[PDB]
Amino acid sequence: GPVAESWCYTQIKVVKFSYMWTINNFSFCREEMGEVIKSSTFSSGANDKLKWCLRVNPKGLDEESKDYLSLYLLLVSCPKSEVRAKFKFSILNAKGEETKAMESQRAYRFVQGKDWGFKKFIRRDFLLDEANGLLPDDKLTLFCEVSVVQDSVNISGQNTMNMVKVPECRLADELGGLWENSRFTDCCLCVAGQEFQAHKAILAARSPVFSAMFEHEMEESKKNRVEINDVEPEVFKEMMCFIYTGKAPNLDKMADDLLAAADKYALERLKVMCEDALCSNLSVENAAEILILADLHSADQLKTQAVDFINYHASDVLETSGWKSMVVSHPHLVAEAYRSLASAQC
Template sequence: ISEEKIPDSAAEMSSVRCYTQCKTEKFSLTWTITKFSFAEAVVRSSSFTNASEELKWSLLLYTNGVSHYEGYLSLYFQLDSGPQTGIRAKGRMVILNSDGEEIKVHTMRDRNVLGFDTFARREDIMDEEAGILRDDTLTVTCEVCSVYITTLNTLDVKVPECRMADELGNLWDQSLLPDCSLVVGGQEFQAHKAILAARCPVFRAMFTHDMKERQTNRVEIQGVEPEVLRELVTFIYSGKAPNIQDMAADLLVAADMYLLDRLKRMCEEVLCRSLTVENAAEILIIADLHLTPELKEEAITFINRWMLYLLFSFSHFSDVLRTPGWKTVQMDHPCLMGELYHSLVSAGASPAKRPRRY
């Protein structure tokens, strides 16, 4: 660097700042491939994105390996959109057996190549005694933390982030300047007609047409618990549902009632990840009644997988059929029972092996 002094008479001087930004994203993916033995040489998963939607990924599986690694399964992450350089990642890529147990585990430690040439030997996967494939289905799960670095030049101006959602949420949380009330279960919540009408078609109809609610500025709500209504209105104001994990089923019903499609899909996503043997029947009923086809399909698939497993253990099967959810399906939803029956037969269960009550 030259030590020559810059003359004071320099006509202009521009000031530019440079900053390097390191971003990390954690995500997980479970990928199920049916009819695996018939899969072509290269199989690609559907695309998925991170929370900020800045990166879009997919998985590539070479069913007979890449060059020089024939006889192996080669598995890689592929970056479909986002920065094409500077991406590094660490995490785990795992093969699950038919009981959901981890069989083959690979750990990535800050690699540039996101995946493995020799992820697993094909003959080990196809070995029936290994119990990895059931009904010719392969399941892979991945947990990844990606890091990407960007360096930018910028003028010395920082634009504040938009905090509109938080500020509108404060109107609701602090009951600032309300002009209407929502009454449910003996509790009364203060709210704002303009915000409710702007964000919810049902409230818009109440406050813009010649209805009682428009005259009284008071809405009597039935069929919703107070804590569920509070969460629903929080979403209307802020676009967020902080307690969705604890009330996804009830919140989905309320979101459907008030035509909040995005909240309904958020609940649907949570329920798809929350299926268990004990709640699958209840979730299936909700999905059928409230027209959520993706959740319904996921519930039926989940039930089929467990039914095929439980059929070989009649005692466990009987315990499941005695749960309240299953009793409701059998007594009140015969059409759903028919769908489950046909789906189970299609999945490969012989009716002769099925308990008579089913």
């Protein structure tokens, strides 16, 4: 593969839908042939405007099928002109593996109110057979995989590439490299007895809390020495590193107290990146202090994610001494735990 003077990359955007659809007590189908069971609407993150609903007929929709479970796919909302897609259906057996996958080799076009699917999907008696385990405890599980493909674009990567080198924006690294040189420092800064020689000009520039704190009746007298004792210098230097370079690479070792510093200094980005570090570090023995830090820092999304962790692991996390401690310390969070596990879950 040699190098060409011009090259084109025709890219077609592909988005996928994964979908569960489980019906309990199916033997109480309560209906004759030709009846329908709709589904709730669902989509994905992007663009979240194309909503889809599933239709399943327990008995034969047609006379040629009769003893056939027929499964269709429906579209209800297409604000664009038209979207065409492929689909692949597979029923989960008792163990959970995808069995009897039927898919269409045609990329059928869909309009609002149009259906496609497999009326001749699976035999009724083959479903009712117990040896293959297609009906575990009268619970049928339908796995729906949707391959929606989108408009195609071309980037036109032709040469005459402007051969002189193109640097990126140096607002970040030039500010970062000024810290170790320690130039243009007009004042002092000491935290926990350790000197970190710094100026106020960019420190107030890149944090609105510190600027308002500096300008109100304190830069006239105590601009040289400012009292900051809420954090250790190891977290303070990372906070000023995020101020200067724009990034905080040292995250996983000390996300717990950088979250507290960010909650103190009202830095939402530093709050949520520590939230990302702790959400992947959600565990059974850690969840109590995860809730206490989420509630103390008012991180609603992290708190809700940790409540969902409680919902998924409620069998073994209740007996922890951490949970005994957070009950005897914070009954209110236990009250919202009751509210979430009762009202939202049921």
